[model samples]
Target: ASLTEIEHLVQSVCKSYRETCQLRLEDLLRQRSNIFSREEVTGYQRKSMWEMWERCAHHLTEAIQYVVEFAKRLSGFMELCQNDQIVLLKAGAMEVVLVRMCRAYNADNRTVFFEGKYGGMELFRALGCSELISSIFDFSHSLSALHFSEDEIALYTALVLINAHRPGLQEKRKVEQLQYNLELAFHHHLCKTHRQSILAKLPPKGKLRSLCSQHVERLQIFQHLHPIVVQAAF
Candidate 1:
């Protein structure tokens, strides 16, 4: 199989998805506590906090759909036994989105665009999960500083999906082989583009799962805080 062919396909999948899907935060904004609402804009009022969580939840939902679609388009992914495909996405989807989120980030201003406006960390305070939010920013800051090309990001995302370490996989060895091929392709592309790399800077490490755990905690808290709002938004 052509390695660059795999590389180009993954890059284009990311490139096209980037060109297309732009999540609109406006829909998640309630009239009661919209971006314009003064108290909500800067305050961590419960009502405002609820809206922020809702928007972030919606942002995550769309990212998963993109992950599923992007993974299927990955050349060898569909060829994996069906159960492996199911288990792989079950665990790794969130990490892929965490990686993708940095793409939406604006390193210069330190804010990711919300489709409506660019709000920095302060604006996100209403969500009330300061540590997790800061961790996300830290990850983004670190990843963005690498100045990774889109293709490199795509390669990493693909590598993330093929991870053989994830449990519940009956065909672990098959997935391992797939992961090996992908990493070989990764080294091929890595040499040409970003240059052979350091352990600290290349892709993400345990930090993604850490960010994800924090994210899940905050979302769970928000749902508990307002079940009605969570249901209503969906």
Candidate 2:
């Protein structure tokens, strides 16, 4: 079996779903929040910051749902047990959400653009979320530098859904093999594009690993401070 053939088919599947994914994301970004009114911040600046989290929580919920549906359609995903699929989705959704949102980041001013509206970092600082925000900036900067093509993004997203180490996996070996095959296919695709020695560089992979850890930490903070975020999203 040609791994190149497999890679191309996955890319085709991803492309087919692009319209559905973009529509869901566009709809979510269109919805505004009144959660700012619930905030008790005396400072006008802080209020905006609080509301930002609320807006993000709602958006996060939408993104999570979108990925869940997308993952279900991936070639091997539905082959996993129901419990395993849920486990993988829970483990990977936030990381995928953050990755997909990289396009919304503006590195020049360290601001985020949601639905074409810009949000500054001042409020992020006021809300004590500066570190998490900075991590996102770093991840977004590194990822954007790589200039992943749409096909590459699709392959990466498919690979992101499988984690052998994730708990509750009944067929861990099968999941691992699936991941290995996908990685090999991606590697072959990369080799076809770039020089062999440049392929040895793992900066993009390292940054993604780092972002996954950061996602866990930042999510914990959100869960602790704004339980609604957890309820609304998970």
Candidate 3:
């Protein structure tokens, strides 16, 4: 497909996605967190944590769903067995969500602009998640270094989503082939437009795979902290 076609694909998929939450302090206070924090549920600090999750959860889900739906449109995505497809989404959703939101991330401030709010890393720190939040900040900066266009981001997301080795996949070879095709397409685009630019210095394919794994690991950590909330959202 031409760049225009690819742009259309990316824009179409993202159009319905919620990028930020336009929430007021009162609005956040009115919401309920799906899980209580380590601090006692009735305490003011736990209430703040719950409010943060309540405000942020839907934004995360929308970003995840956008990536999932975008992956479903890849030529080889639907060729996989239904069970395998579900597994891919379950494993890859958060990574793609983070990638998609990188464009809006303010690395300098270590704050992400989500759904309309500028949430600082301190929020996650309050949950004993300072390390993960900081790592995501680092990752966001790494991604920003490449200066990926929207189309490139979409293509890269598809490449990362179809992991051949993910457990529960019965047809690994087919998944591998799909991933190969996506890599070739991504390579072709880079060669055409960004041959001598920063793209040449980045090990994007392998890096994407690693980042996806980390995102899944981060999800595990979150699930450990709030099993019901995390489980219900994804």
* Candidate 2 local lDDT, 1-234, one digit each (tens): 477676675565466347335444344334323122213223335555456666666677777887787787676778888888888988787777777765555555555555335555444555566777777777776665665555566566767777688888888988887787677666776677673443444346556667778767766676567755244322
State the lDDT of candidate 1 residue by residue for 134-215, as single tens digits: 8888888888888766667777878888899989998999899888877777777777665677335764567777777777
Q: Cα RMSD to native, each candidate?
A: 5.6, 5.7, 7.5
Candidate 3 residue lDDT tens string, 1-234: 566654454454333232221122234333322233335323423445445554455457656655666666666677889999999988777767777656766555555554344455554544455665677777787776676666576666675677887899889999987776666666666666654365565546666567667666655565556543343322
Give the residue spans of candidate 1 off by over 4 A. Answer: 1-40, 43-47, 198-200, 224-234
**Model 2 Cα RMSD, 1 decimal:** 5.7
Q: Which scores better on lDDT, 1 or 2?
A: 1
Model 3: how far residue 60 lies from native, Å: 1.8
* Clash statistics: count for each candidate: 0, 0, 6
Worst 10 residues of 1 by lDDT: 25-34
Better of 2 and 3 by lDDT: 2
Clashing pairs in 1: none
Better of 1 and 2 by TM-score: 1
**Number of the top TM-score candidate:** 1
